[PDB]
Design an enzyme around this catalytic site. Structure first.
Site, short mmCIF file in Angstrom:
data_model
loop_
_atom_site.label_atom_id
_atom_site.label_comp_id
_atom_site.label_asym_id
_atom_site.label_seq_id
_atom_site.Cartn_x
_atom_site.Cartn_y
_atom_site.Cartn_z
CG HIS A 61 -0.22 -0.26 2.51
ND1 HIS A 61 0.31 0.75 3.29
CD2 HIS A 61 0.07 -1.42 3.14
CE1 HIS A 61 0.88 0.23 4.36
NE2 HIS A 61 0.75 -1.09 4.29
CG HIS A 91 5.03 6.06 6.05
ND1 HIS A 91 5.23 5.90 7.40
CD2 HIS A 91 3.73 6.41 5.90
CE1 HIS A 91 4.11 6.15 8.05
NE2 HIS A 91 3.18 6.46 7.16
CG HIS A 93 -0.12 8.49 4.11
ND1 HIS A 93 -0.90 7.35 4.23
CD2 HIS A 93 0.67 8.51 5.21
CE1 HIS A 93 -0.58 6.72 5.34
NE2 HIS A 93 0.37 7.40 5.96
CD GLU A 103 -2.96 9.16 5.99
OE1 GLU A 103 -2.17 8.95 6.93
OE2 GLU A 103 -3.76 8.29 5.58
CG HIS A 116 2.66 10.13 8.29
ND1 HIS A 116 1.58 9.31 8.03
CD2 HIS A 116 2.16 11.39 8.41
CE1 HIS A 116 0.48 10.04 7.99
NE2 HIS A 116 0.80 11.30 8.22
CB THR A 196 -3.54 7.27 9.24
OG1 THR A 196 -2.41 6.88 8.45
CG2 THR A 196 -3.11 8.40 10.18
C1 LIG Z 1 2.32 -0.81 15.07
C2 LIG Z 1 3.35 -0.61 13.96
C3 LIG Z 1 4.78 -0.87 14.39
O1 LIG Z 1 3.23 0.71 13.42
C4 LIG Z 1 2.73 0.71 12.06
C5 LIG Z 1 2.29 2.04 11.53
C6 LIG Z 1 3.01 3.18 11.93
C7 LIG Z 1 2.61 4.46 11.53
C8 LIG Z 1 1.49 4.60 10.72
S1 LIG Z 1 1.01 6.07 10.29
N1 LIG Z 1 0.40 6.14 8.80
O2 LIG Z 1 2.07 7.03 10.43
O3 LIG Z 1 -0.03 6.37 11.20
C9 LIG Z 1 0.76 3.48 10.36
C10 LIG Z 1 1.15 2.20 10.76
C11 LIG Z 1 2.63 -0.56 11.64
C12 LIG Z 1 2.20 -1.12 10.32
C13 LIG Z 1 1.18 -2.06 10.29
C14 LIG Z 1 0.76 -2.61 9.09
C15 LIG Z 1 1.36 -2.22 7.90
C16 LIG Z 1 2.38 -1.27 7.95
F1 LIG Z 1 2.97 -0.86 6.83
C17 LIG Z 1 2.80 -0.72 9.15
C18 LIG Z 1 3.01 -1.42 12.74
O4 LIG Z 1 3.10 -2.63 12.69
ZN LIG Z 2 1.46 7.28 7.63
#
Ligand SMILES: CC1(C)OC(c2ccc(S(N)(=O)=O)cc2)=C(c2cccc(F)c2)C1=O
Ligand SMILES: [Zn+2]
Ligand SMILES: CC1(C)OC(c2ccc(S(N)(=O)=O)cc2)=C(c2cccc(F)c2)C1=O
Ligand SMILES: CC1(C)OC(c2ccc(S(N)(=O)=O)cc2)=C(c2cccc(F)c2)C1=O
Length: 257
Positions: A61, A91, A93, A103, A116, A196
């Site tokens: 994704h 990363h 979005h 976002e 992010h 998110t």
């Molecule tokens: C809990 C932990 C370590 O953190 C993230 C994660 C961090 C930050 C954001 S965001 N978009 O910044 O909120 C979103 C998700 C994932 C994660 C889970 C599934 C797929 C993936 F690619 C990442 C994790 O496994």
């Molecule tokens: Zn993110």
């Protein structure tokens, strides 16, 4: 399973991830009239060691740039935090179009994309895994990106993309300090929220920068040229991966300014 499309996107997430309808979900619209200045907020301090940059990987994704997790060489502190948080990845979005892909939104305004920078509370917890689902476990800096002039600081990331075209592809990615992607002002908002996308844990203290950074249409096109499919399958472009904003449900957004 989950994704961003007609069948598995944000509208569908609460079926397997009921916390999608929780009270601390992210992203949110920041209404500047309703933020509260917090004089007890300290300035944000980031100190990243370029040597902690490890790899770049296509996660289907999105794509992630991972950092070595051994020690506190690369940390975030200050702001609303008592603890130091350890950097583990950054990363982006983006959206199907160049004008609509961030976002977070500010006063109802959607930006082109979003950076992010994710950290975990290594002061208190044993591992990223232990911190992952704790209310105080994660810290993420969000930077709104606005299409316009090419951003020279993105270049190393962009050049690496051709090496991770399909899901699961990984390439080395070393000697990079992502603090160079941050805006000059470090005025910020902060609020308690979530990942998110699934698993959507309400484990995130968000730090959203007041100033945007730039990105060109051609650079965004490089993001979208990645494929979500595994090599050998039919090509599915990584066209968009932003979640709609969620209701604040009583939360207060604090401003450092
Ligand atoms: C809990 C932990 C370590 O953190 C993230 C994660 C961090 C930050 C954001 S965001 N978009 O910044 O909120 C979103 C998700 C994932 C994660 C889970 C599934 C797929 C993936 F690619 C990442 C994790 O496994
Ligand atoms: Zn993110
Ligand atoms: C959904 C599930 C189980 O979680 C992650 C994942 C978790 C955490 C983070 S991170 N960098 O800590 O945020 C990133 C990714 C992957 C994954 C990891 C590498 C390549 C890939 F194609 C998928 C998954 O398949
Ligand atoms: C390996 C890594 C980074 O860690 C966790 C993770 C570990 C432990 C806990 S907990 N706090 O023990 O329940 C929570 C999350 C996930 C993860 C990612 C997507 C979905 C999911 F369900 C878990 C990861 O991909």
């Amino acid at each position: 399973d989950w994704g961003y499309d007609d069948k598995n996107g944000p509208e569908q997430w609460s079926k397997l991830y009921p916390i999608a309808n929780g009270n601390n979900q992210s992203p949110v619209d920041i209404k500047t009239s309703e933020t509260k200045h917090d004089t007890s907020l300290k300035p944000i301090s980031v100190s990243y060691n370029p040597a902690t940059a490890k790899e770049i990987i296509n996660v289907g994704h999105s794509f992630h740039v991972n950092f070595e997790d051994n020690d506190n060489r690369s940390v975030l502190k200050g702001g609303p935090f008592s603890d130091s948080y350890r950097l583990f990845q950054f990363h982006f979005h983006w959206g199907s179009t160049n004008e609509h892909g961030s976002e977070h939104t500010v006063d109802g305004v959607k930006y082109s994309a979003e950076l992010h920078v994710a950290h975990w509370n290594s002061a208190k917890y044993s591992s990223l895994a232990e911190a992952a689902s704790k209310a105080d476990g994660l810290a993420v800096i969000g930077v709104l990106m606005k299409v316009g002039e090419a951003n020279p600081k993105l270049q190393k990331v962009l050049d690496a993309l051709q090496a991770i075209k399909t899901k699961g592809k990984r390439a080395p990615f070393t000697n990079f300090d992502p603090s160079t992607l941050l805006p000059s002002s470090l005025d910020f908002w902060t609020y308690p929220g979530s990942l998110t996308h699934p698993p959507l844990y309400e484990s995130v203290t968000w730090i959203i920068c007041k100033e945007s950074i730039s990105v060109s249409s051609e650079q965004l096109a490089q993001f979208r040229s990645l494929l979500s499919n595994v090599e050998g399958d039919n090509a599915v472009p990584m066209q968009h991966n932003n979640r709609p904003t969620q209701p604040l449900k009583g939360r207060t957004v604090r401003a450092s300014f």
